Amino acid sequence: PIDLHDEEYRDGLEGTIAKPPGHVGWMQRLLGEGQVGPIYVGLWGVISFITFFASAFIILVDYGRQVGWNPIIYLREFWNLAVYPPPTEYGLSWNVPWDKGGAWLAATFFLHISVLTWWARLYTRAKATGVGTQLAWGFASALSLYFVIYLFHPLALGNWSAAPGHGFRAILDWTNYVSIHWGNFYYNPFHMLSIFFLLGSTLLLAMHGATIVATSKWKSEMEFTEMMAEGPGTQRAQLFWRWVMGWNANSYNIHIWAWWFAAFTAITGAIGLFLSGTLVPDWYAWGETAKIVAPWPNPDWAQYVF
Amino acid sequence: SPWPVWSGYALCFVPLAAVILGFIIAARFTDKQATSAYLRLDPAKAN
Amino acid sequence: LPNDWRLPLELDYPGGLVVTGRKDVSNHEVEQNQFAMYHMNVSMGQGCTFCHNARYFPSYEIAQ
Amino acid sequence: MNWIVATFMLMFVLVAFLPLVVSLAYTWVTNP
Amino acid sequence: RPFEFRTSVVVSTLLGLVMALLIHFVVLSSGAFNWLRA
Amino acid sequence: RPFEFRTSVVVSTLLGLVMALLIHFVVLSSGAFNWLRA
Amino acid sequence: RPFEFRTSVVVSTLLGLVMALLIHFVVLSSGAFNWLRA
Amino acid sequence: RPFEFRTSVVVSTLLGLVMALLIHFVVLSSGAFNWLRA
Amino acid sequence: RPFEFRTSVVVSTLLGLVMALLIHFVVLSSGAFNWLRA
Amino acid sequence: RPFEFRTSVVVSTLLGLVMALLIHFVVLSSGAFNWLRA
Amino acid sequence: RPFEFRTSVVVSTLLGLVMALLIHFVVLSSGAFNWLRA
Amino acid sequence: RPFEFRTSVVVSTLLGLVMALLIHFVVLSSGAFNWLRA
Amino acid sequence: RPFEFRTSVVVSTLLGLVMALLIHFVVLSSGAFNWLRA
Amino acid sequence: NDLVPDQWKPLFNNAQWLVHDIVVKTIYGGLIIAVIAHVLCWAWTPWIR
Amino acid sequence: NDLVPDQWKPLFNNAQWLVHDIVVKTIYGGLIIAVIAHVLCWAWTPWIR
Amino acid sequence: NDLVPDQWKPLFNNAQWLVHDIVVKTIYGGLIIAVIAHVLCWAWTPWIR
Amino acid sequence: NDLVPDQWKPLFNNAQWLVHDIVVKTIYGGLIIAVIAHVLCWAWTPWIR
Amino acid sequence: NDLVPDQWKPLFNNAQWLVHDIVVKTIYGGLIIAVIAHVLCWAWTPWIR
Amino acid sequence: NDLVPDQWKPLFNNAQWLVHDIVVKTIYGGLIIAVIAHVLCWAWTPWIR
Amino acid sequence: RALPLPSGETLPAASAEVIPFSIIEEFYKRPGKTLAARFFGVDPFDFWIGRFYVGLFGAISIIGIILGVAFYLYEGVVNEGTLNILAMRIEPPPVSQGLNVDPAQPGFFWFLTMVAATIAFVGWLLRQIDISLKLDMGMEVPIAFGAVVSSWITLQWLRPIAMGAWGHGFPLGITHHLDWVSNIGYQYYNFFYNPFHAIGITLLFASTLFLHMHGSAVLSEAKRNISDQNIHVFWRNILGYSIGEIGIHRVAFWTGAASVLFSNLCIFLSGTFVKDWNAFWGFWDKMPIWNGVG
Ligand code: BCL
Ligand code: BCL
Ligand code: BCL
Ligand code: BCL
Ligand code: BCL
Ligand code: BCL
Ligand code: BCL
Ligand code: BCL
Ligand SMILES: [Fe+3]
């Protein structure tokens, strides 16, 4: 019903650009399969590419203006250059001088367009091949947090200055500044839920990978074939965890667990970040009203000073 | 004065109750379906 | 720090530099604050917990 | 004193690093 | 028929739209025209 | 049966219990009733 | 079929909606019209 | 058997125990009864 | 067969467009021409 | 057969372009030629 | 059998032990009995 | 047979280019030659 | 082969190059030779 | 399959034609309303000035 | 599929011709409007000065 | 599949038609209520001013 | 591939030869223009001094 | 596969030989130019001093 | 094969031998130049003092 | 009739057959291959109480578990009297006391809790080695767990011993170890700028990404009739590379293991050799290539 060959080679707009496949070699010896092969370009594929190339061009040219078009200095201070959103004056106004904050707005707009078109590409290419569309919905879950950071949170605060600034060290600075601004960002409870889910996600990943590699000898890696008929490998993998921690899951459930942990991470993160600027101005002062701050009447500060 | 304010409950005890309940229910259901009876390959042959 | 930067001495300084939870200041003010704080850090030999108790920055418990 | 013990503890940290490398090299060898 | 016509029209209408938008943004942000309270 | 009956009773009991508990905790913490030394 | 009609209508309705939204946002934030307490 | 009896008794004894414990804790910590040096 | 013609035209128009854009940005930002309030 | 001609021309036209651009930027930023208001 | 007897005795002796320990801790830490230098 | 010739020429022309560039940069930035306004 | 010959030559030329570069940089930065305005 | 005129026969199916008619009608109505709304916001306060 | 003239027969299909016509007409109209708009924003305030 | 008129026969199934009717009726009612509500908040305090 | 001379027969195909002619001609022209441009900037202001 | 001398027959293919020749010639020319340029940079201002 | 002497036959292939020879010659030349350069850097200004 | 399947689907009618779970436990018991019995000639317990396998390593672990929980409850409930887990804090002995520990001085119970917890964790690790050894699978899970155990060892044993104060171990207690983390992060300015730190968070985010992608890939092909090359083709259409079935699990294992190792390195280093992280990057500006061009 579905021809894979006509879906691997089909000219342009409806086909792949890099028709000849290639071999990486060292990837083959350590990563399993090691062929690069063709990459499909569609209608949605060309749009995200050109919009991302526009935003990156806008940002890269504006770096050069800051250094005076000096390539020696440009290469030296590349990692601490950035472009910043408008200041608190003219908070939401769109008419700002190019050098002060005007370059940031166009770049962020083209970045948004590229992201949404990439989502559409994911969805359409998933439907075309006959497989389900779960990856697209997960990407949407991550886009929720992405859009809260850059669009929804600066809006509803009145300032475009709340968003980050398109720099390598600028993002660390943004994290630090927001946490300091709200005050004791550790106390935010949805931040606690997000950390719980993130560390659970890393836990699950390491465990699933490790057990599957250990039981590889019996061809337990092919998770699709095992779903119809469980071989000796899957039978051993269940028994190992049953004796250690008292319960276990087959090959179908464990991937549900993985998916849901990874998605809850980003959803709880977005919900928790949105509330910081609007409902609860100070998080630590809120925690002492919820009776969850350690009393610490007199600490031993000799440790912290040198 | 002795009691945690409102929104202490909503913000901190929706997580602390809901997450523990969710884990204890989801584990029951996954382990049930896993230890249930369905198609497998024989231990005496495949291994 | 940027080389053009200097310690801003045209402020009342009984608490004029405060930024926590103010809701009328954005990340630009916080950046200026952190510049001044790192300067105070390099001037003093000790570290940043010399006088702050980083759990709550507006607290005055260290007395330094 | 301080520095002898410090170097000796850094040894243990690198030893913790060690097993992962053996895993990688075993996979490289036994998968020609 | 090596060159697909539709690829040409797609890239043309994308490049034109992006270029109009970029010029419109630059001119607005330059603040040299007294347009929308300037 | 469009629905399993037991799912309905499970979700009903859970929602009712949570709702009673939340209302009882809000009313107690409001401090407007002089109940248990208030 | 070289051109699918539905792709055209999809991209048209997306571009039009985005463009209306962007213009509305820019005009509101310019503060030059005395609309919603300005 | 649509509903297993033992599930009912398990959930019943768990909910009852948790509820007794929570009420006992709240009453003790309220400090309104002069019980164990109060 | 040895050199696809369309690859040449694609890379040509991309390089030309990027180069025109870069030169116009540099000339505008140099501030030496009195163009758009300078 | 061993050495593809097109790889040579590709790397040649990339290296030459990058080198021209780098030299042009260094000479402009040195400020020793009185070119574009210097 | 609807219930394994040994599960009942296991959970019973665990709950009883935990409960005795918790009550013994709370009473000791309350400091209201003059027991072990109080 | 023990070595592919093209790997040798590739690594040779990369190392030589990098080395020329690095020496040129160091000599320019040392400021000891009075070259381009120094 | 107890040691592939090419591994030996690769590691040899890498170690030699790194060592020459490091010694050169140390000698230049020591400032004890009056070389390039010192 | 045969309701569309001959000039546009290779392009449009039969069902695709009626939808195209709805789209054209909606676009015309929207343009008329847009022009009216624009005339009204200048009679209010001009933007170019 | 022989509606296109012979000079351009190898390149254009039959359906690809009518769209090309639409594209050319739209481009001409757009250029006329662009020229008019440019004359107007120069009469308003010149940008080169 | 024969309750829908001929002009819309290739698009709509039989069941999809009655839903469409419900949707149109709901949309008309909603628009009437929306117009009334906007006349009212206007009379209260205008927002263009 | 028989248009290329015998001494370069293995290295070059027959299409690869004409493009290589174009490349050589372009490189020669570029070098001449580069030399002229360098003589001119030097007459303007010398860099080495 | 037989244009290279016997001593170097196991190493070099036929095509790999002519490139080697080009590489050697280029390296010799580059070395001559490099020597001339250093003699000139020395006569200008010595670096060791 | 069989060009390498018997004592080193189990280690070296045929092709690996000529490369080696090149490596040894290069190393000897480099050592001679290094010794000369060191004698010169010493005559200029000694570093141990 | 209907064939129950591992994914819950029931098929409308292969060496596969419906086998109840118990059968596969009795066949894979094989008692006596314990890592400990290798060294002693015998294992003391090995009797699979309930669903849990018991070994010599399991018993020392359970000792550690019970004693640690009891000491944790004794601290903060007695001698503090807060009766709220969130409010209680279990604190290490002061820095003035030094490396030596004394029953009369405070912090004695924190030390007991820490030692019991270490014993329990190591016993658990050995028990995992053991149970894997009986099944003859392989040693990957013990390695992956040993990584995080080594992180715990660095935080509570190595870094305090190198400085020598014993007060440097992070205080136990919910919502108070966060205060320690926050006071340590700011003690050395710009912990973000720390290079070994930034690699850990990079690997953490990359791990969450890999997990989401693998889960969505397997869930998408779960219940449908396809060639099994459809997922590979989809992966080649998006980003132009398909890692394979055996490849993704190796990568999961490796990234997971590497994150914690870089992290424990960064913290141990910050305590002992680097006072602040901004001064570390002072060398970059003065790299000769560009030291004078400004
Ligand atoms: C006021 C003068 C400002 C300035 C402001 C702008 C702005 C603002 C714009 C331009 C744009 C252009 N300018 Mg100007 N421009 C200035 C100075 C210059 C100078 C110079 C002196 O050197 C030059 C060479 C140009 C040259 C140009 C062209 C590159 C470009 C449009 C050419 C063309 O016709 O469009 C090519 C052909 C078309 C665009 C086809 C149009 C297609 C159809 C008609 C679009 C219809 C859209 C419709 C509304 C959508 C709904 C339709 C549905 C059917 C309902 N400008 C000064 C600084 N200039 C325009 C641009 O490129 O955007 C595209 C742009 O918006
Ligand atoms: C003093 C007045 C306080 C207030 C305090 C509370 C508190 C406190 C509670 C409510 C609850 C309710 N309130 Mg009130 N409430 C107030 C003002 C209002 C107002 C308003 C003016 O608008 C409204 C509309 C309501 C409306 C309501 C309903 C939503 C709800 C219970 C309805 C019902 O019968 O239960 C629905 C039906 C039942 C609950 C079935 C009960 C099932 C069986 C009988 C439970 C037995 C439990 C048993 C003890 C377990 C052991 C049994 C074993 C067999 C041994 N309240 C003011 C602010 N209100 C109650 C709530 O919903 O909790 C559920 C709640 O606890
Ligand atoms: C007050 C004047 C403000 C300004 C404010 C706005 C705002 C605000 C908007 C525009 C929009 C437009 N402006 Mg204006 N605009 C200004 C100055 C200009 C200038 C200039 C002087 O150069 C130009 C050229 C334009 C040109 C334009 C067009 C690009 C665009 C709409 C054209 C069209 O008809 O829509 C194309 C055709 C349509 C939109 C089809 C409509 C489709 C149907 C009718 C939509 C129905 C929606 C319905 C409510 C949904 C529910 C229906 C269900 C059935 C119930 N404006 C000044 C600055 N302008 C509008 C925009 O593009 O958004 C669309 C926009 O909202
Ligand atoms: C005012 C003088 C400024 C300066 C400002 C600029 C600017 C600004 C530009 C150049 C550009 C160029 N300059 Mg100049 N330039 C200066 C000094 C110099 C000096 C010097 C003294 O040494 C040199 C050698 C050059 C040399 C050059 C060339 C490298 C380049 C264009 C050559 C060519 O014809 O285009 C090659 C051939 C073409 C570009 C083909 C054009 C293709 C078609 C005609 C494009 C049509 C576009 C159309 C609008 C799209 C819509 C069409 C649809 C059908 C509707 N400039 C000084 C500093 N120069 C231009 C550049 O390269 O951009 C491309 C550029 O924009
Ligand atoms: C004014 C003197 C400035 C200086 C400024 C520059 C600048 C600026 C440039 C150079 C460039 C070069 N300089 Mg100089 N240069 C200086 C001092 C030196 C010194 C020194 C004293 O030691 C040296 C050795 C050099 C040496 C060189 C070469 C490395 C290089 C070009 C060589 C060649 O011909 O191009 C190799 C061959 C070619 C470039 C082939 C050209 C290909 C075709 C002709 C390109 C046509 C482009 C066309 C416009 C595109 C449109 C065409 C379409 C068909 C329409 N310069 C001083 C500091 N020098 C140029 C560079 O390399 O860029 C390439 C460069 O732009
Ligand atoms: C001094 C009074 C203190 C107080 C201090 C304590 C302490 C301390 C304890 C209790 C315990 C209990 N208290 Mg009291 N208690 C107080 C006030 C109260 C009040 C009240 C006024 O409302 C009530 C209702 C209770 C009620 C209770 C019961 C819930 C419970 C024991 C009941 C029973 O018999 O055990 C149920 C049946 C048994 C425990 C079976 C015993 C099994 C065998 C005999 C155990 C032998 C252990 C043996 C040593 C192990 C070695 C044997 C080997 C063979 C060698 N206390 C006041 C505050 N209370 C005890 C508890 O529950 O611990 C379990 C507990 O330790
Ligand atoms: C600034 C001064 C005026 C102002 C000036 C103008 C002017 C001037 C205009 C508008 C226009 C409009 N303004 Mg306004 N506007 C103002 C304040 C407001 C306020 C409010 C909060 O105060 C609102 C709600 C609006 C809302 C609107 C809409 C009525 C309309 C835009 C239509 C459009 O963009 O959609 C178009 C959306 C799309 C193109 C797609 C529509 C989607 C279809 C209908 C849904 C069916 C889809 C179908 C199922 C197929 C599915 C495909 C999917 C796309 C995938 N304005 C202020 C007061 N506004 C423009 C308008 O009326 O023209 C019609 C107009 O020209
Ligand atoms: C201002 C404060 C600084 C800060 C200061 C620190 C400090 C200080 C540290 C970290 C460390 C970590 N931080 Mg940091 N960190 C900050 C900002 C961040 C940000 C962010 C987005 O901004 C991120 C993602 C991280 C991420 C991380 C990782 C680099 C690392 C995680 C610890 C871990 O893996 O090992 C932790 C491993 C263990 C301790 C787990 C041991 C668990 C044992 C084996 C299990 C016990 C069983 C238990 C009882 C449960 C029993 C089960 C039964 C069910 C009950 N930091 C801020 C900037 N960060 C920590 C690190 O380096 O790790 C060493 C650390 O030292
Ligand atoms: Fe899996």
Author numbering:
A (entry chain M): 335 to 640
B (entry chain Z): 12 to 58
C (entry chain C): 193 to 256
D (entry chain Y): 1 to 32
E (entry chain A), F (entry chain J), G (entry chain D), H (entry chain N), I (entry chain 9), J (entry chain 7), ...: 4 to 41
N (entry chain E), O (entry chain B), P (entry chain G), Q (entry chain 8), R (entry chain 6), S (entry chain 4): 7 to 55
T (entry chain L): 6 to 18, 29 to 309
What does the paper say about this structure?
The 15 LHαβ heterodimers formed an opened elliptical ring surrounding the RC, which contained L, M, and cyt c subunits; the long and short axes were 112 Å and 103 Å, respectively, and a tetraheme binding domain of cyt c protruded into the periplasmic space.
To investigate the role of Cars in the assembly of RC-LH, R. castenholzii cells were treated with Car biosynthesis inhibitor diphenylamine (DPA) to produce a dRC-LH; a 3.1 Å resolution cryo-EM structure of this complex resolved five KγC molecules bound in the interior of the LH ring (KγCint). The most obvious difference between these two structures was the absence of the entire X subunit and the cytoplasmic region of cyt c subunit (Pro6-Val16) in the dRC-LH; both were located at the LH opening of nRC-LH. Notably, only five KγCint molecules that spanned the LHαβ5, -7, -9, -10, and -11 heterodimers were resolved with clear density maps and built in the dRC-LH structure, whereas none of the KγCext molecules were observed. The absence of subunit X and exterior KγC (KγCext) molecules in the dRC-LH produced an LH ring with exposed LHαβ interface and a larger opening than that of nRC-LH. Nevertheless, the distances between adjacent LHαs and LHβs in the dRC-LH showed average increases of 0.5 Å and 1.0 Å, respectively, compared with nRC-LH. The accelerated quinone/quinol exchange rate in dRC-LH was probably resulted from exposure of the LHαβ interface by Car depletion, and also the increased gap dimension of the LH ring. The results revealed that the Car-to-BChl energy transfer efficiency remained similar between nRC-LH (44%) and dRC-LH (46%).
